[PDB]
Every structure is written in C-alpha cells, then in structure tokens.
C-alpha cells in the first residue's frame, strides 16, 4: 500500500478511536455501531475485535487495522473508499447522484432532511449545472 493509502486508512481509524489513544476497543467499536442503528452484544463486539486482533492483546492497533483494510483492498472487487462511497450514493449506477438517491442515503444514515436542504446540497456540488452530482463533483465536494 502507498503512503497516501495508509493516510486514508488512518482517517478511517480515527473515526473510531474515540479517545485518540491509537487503539480501537470493543466499547469504541460498539459506540460507532450504536450510532449506525446497530446494537451488537458484548460477545459479538469481542468476536469482531478478536478476528482482527493479531497479537491478541484485546484491542486493535493501527497495524492490525491496516492488515484488515489492506486485505480488503488487495482483492479484485475492492475499490478505493471514495469510489465505494460514491456507489452507495449512486445506486442506479448511471454515474450521477440524484436528489432521490441523496435522500435515500441520508435516510439510511439517519440524517433528517427537507427538500430545500437536498436541493441546496446538490446545487452547491453541481458544477456543470446538470442537476445531479457526478463523480468528479462528488470528489471535489467531499
């Protein structure tokens, strides 16, 4: 993996590391999962950590996180996080994100919305003015 790739995964790791101490605990994993609408049990959190806890000290450090992330990338069907994310938004895969597609992602992620907010979000990202957000515009905005 390149240094830029390592940096991206550091960003991801930091979205979980609540205390910023360099490790992801079962409790931290659970907080993120709870925020996403999931309520895993303690043993469940323990197995998720265990499967990736290479040295077995009970928490996940960045090297272990990287091994996991690297394993995912080093696979034919795995794309870059940014591209994978764009595809979550662009469900019909035509390369453009519609208002309906944006409302769907926001709803799925528990983000409240109004039509005006959605229209301004698109407008702000819509550089070529075609009424939708293409990949290039998606990258620029994100």
């Amino acid at each position: 993996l390149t240094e830029e790739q390592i940096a991206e995964f550091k960003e991801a790791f930091s979205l979980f590391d609540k205390d910023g101490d360099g490790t992801i605990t079962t409790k931290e994993l659970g907080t993120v999962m709870r925020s996403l609408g999931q309520n895993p049990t303690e043993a469940e959190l323990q197995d998720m950590i265990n499967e990736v806890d290479a040295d077995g000290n009970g928490t996940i450090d960045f090297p272990e996180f990287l091994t996991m992330m690297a394993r995912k990338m080093k696979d034919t069907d795995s794309e870059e996080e940014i591209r994978e994310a764009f595809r979550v938004f662009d469900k019909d895969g035509n390369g453009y994100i519609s208002a309906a597609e944006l409302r769907h992602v926001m709803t799925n992620l528990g983000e409240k919305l109004t039509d005006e907010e959605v229209d301004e979000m698109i407008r702000e990202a819509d550089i070529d003015g075609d009424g939708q957000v293409n990949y290039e515009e998606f990258v620029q905005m994100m």
Partner: peptide, 27 residues
C-alpha cells in the same frame, strides 16, 4: 451556511458503516 458540512458528515458516516462491514467481511 454552506452545505459542505452535511455532505462531509454523510461521507464520514458511510465510511464508518463500510469499516464495520469490513470487520465482518474480513475472512
């Protein structure tokens, strides 16, 4: 009053969702 913050929050929430799935897909 820019909308960039909402866009950025969605990306971050999705990135977290994908990492959780990765903890599950691992094998």
């Amino acid at each position: 009053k820019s909308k960039k913050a909402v866009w950025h929050k969605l990306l971050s929430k999705q990135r977290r969702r994908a990492v959780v799935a990765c903890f599950r897909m691992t094998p």
